[PDB]
Design a protein that fits this description.
homodimer; 91 residues; 4 helices
């Protein structure tokens, strides 16, 4: 018998998230190499939007909702912030 | 007295390099934020060339010296591989 019950269900609360040291570059150096020895294709096209999304969302956080303010935040403008959004989706 | 001598000099050999888990994204999320609360400016312009240099050099390694082959390696061409080289230096 045990005091605590055998709780076995995934609920919303009681679920902390862990943030380990993500070795992105280490994953990109080994990934780009593993794909090169098999069938590489969208190499830079995959991490390209990854770096843009991270920063874009971060700076935007300073102005959540104000996607325009994010422009001056990254030395960009309103055409780049918008054109760069489809550039990764088009290229 | 000790068998080994007190070797205290930096030489070429006898110098192994360590490669810990670099948390780039973690450094970019905290850096972009720390700079935003002070004087942000070249936010994306700093990590932009960092992601391009890493992949560019990696794929090029498959064709060391053949900077041209790196083109098809990243679904790029000869104009992009060259134009993208100055794009980060110009923007």
């Amino acid at each position: 018998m045990d005091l605590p019950g055998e709780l076995f269900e995934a609920s919303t609360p009681d679920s902390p998230s862990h943030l380990p040291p993500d070795s992105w570059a280490t994953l990109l150096a080994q990934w780009a190499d593993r794909a090169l020895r098999s069938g590489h294709q969208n190499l830079l096209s995959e991490a390209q939007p990854e770096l843009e999304r991270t920063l874009l969302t971060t700076a935007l956080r300073h102005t959540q909702g104000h996607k325009q303010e994010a422009a001056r935040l990254l030395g960009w403008g309103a055409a780049t912030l918008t054109a760069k959004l489809k550039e990764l989706g088009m290229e």
